[PDB]
Design a protein around this ligand. Structure first.
Ligand SMILES: CNc1cc(Oc2c(Cl)cc(NC(=O)Nc3cccc(C(F)(F)F)c3)cc2Cl)ncn1
Length: 262
């Protein structure tokens, strides 16, 4: 199974653990630890791994990562595949921190152009993922999974955390496979999060906020201040009906159009 991955993975992506230099620990998880370090004269982040469940996730992640090549998506450096002790995933380190920190922790006041540049960059990355021959549903797009360069540009990542006529809506929805349009919903919430500088339903806990969007059809408030083209993107973006949400190819277009008038 691992051998099948070794073969499909381009040779230049093959790392030897000795090639990788581990400095500090940045985060933890079910998979193991995430180190910062140095590899091939680059400052990198290393996802070091500690069952068949765990390995299935490892192969999945590498298979995803070796395909990704876009300036708005995380950048794969390589993977070490010799034996399950040495399993690691290396990516180019990004130093500007998450979008979450910029908005809610550093609480920095942002120009509309600064806001729109991050928003466009995230839309491009998503457009990229959705337009792969085998499209990738991020499924967990949020401001924690959006990293920033020091000049204000953004990158999309993933830290890794019967008859229908009479069916209850919650039951119907579980029988309906979700699509890439699930990312457009998440994205819309991020877009609101950018412009307002507030966490979506900040006064609520996560599961409480989710229930109000699903059961009670509540969205974050869209003020008059927010520009017409973007408030439009919001309205259509977090539409309960997936088919009513726009593609990222259109999202990029509308947003780039805005960057010209600013
Ligand atoms: C703190 N600066 C960092 C941290 C860092 O850690 C990471 C991150 Cl953030 C991500 C990943 N790997 C992935 O994101 N993999 C992935 C899997 C499925 C889909 C996607 C995507 F991009 F399509 F959403 C990405 C690994 C590490 Cl070590 N990396 C850089 N700078």
């Amino acid at each position: 199974d691992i051998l099948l991955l070794r073969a499909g993975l381009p040779s230049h992506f093959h790392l030897q653990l000795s090639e990788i230099e581990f400095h500090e620990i940045i985060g933890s998880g079910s998979f193991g630890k995430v180190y910062k370090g140095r590899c091939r004269n680059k400052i990198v982040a290393i996802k070091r791994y500690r069952s068949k469940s765990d390995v299935d996730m490892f192969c999945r992640e590498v298979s995803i990562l070796c395909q990704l090549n876009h300036p708005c998506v995380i950048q794969f450096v390589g993977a070490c595949l010799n034996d399950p002790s040495q399993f690691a995933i290396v990516t180019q380190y990004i130093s500007g921190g998450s979008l979450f920190s910029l908005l809610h922790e550093q609480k920095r006041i942002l120009d509309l152009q600064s806001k729109l540049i991050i928003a466009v960059d995230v839309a491009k990355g998503m457009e990229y993922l959705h337009n792969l021959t085998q499209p990738i549903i991020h499924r967990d797009l949020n401001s924690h999974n959006i990293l920033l360069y020091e000049d204000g540009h953004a990158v999309v990542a993933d830290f890794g955390e019967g008859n229908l006529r009479w069916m209850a809506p919650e039951v119907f929805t579980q029988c309906t496979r979700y699509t890439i349009k699930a990312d457009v919903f998440s994205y819309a919430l991020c877009l609101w999060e950018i412009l307002t500088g507030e966490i979506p339903f900040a006064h609520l806990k996560p599961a409480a906020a989710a229930a109000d969007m699903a059961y009670h059809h509540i969205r974050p408030p869209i003020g008059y201040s927010i520009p017409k083209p973007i408030s439009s993107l919001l309205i259509r973006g977090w539409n309960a009906c997936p088919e009513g949400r726009p593609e990222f190819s259109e999202v990029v277009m509308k947003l780039e159009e805005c960057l010209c008038n600013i």
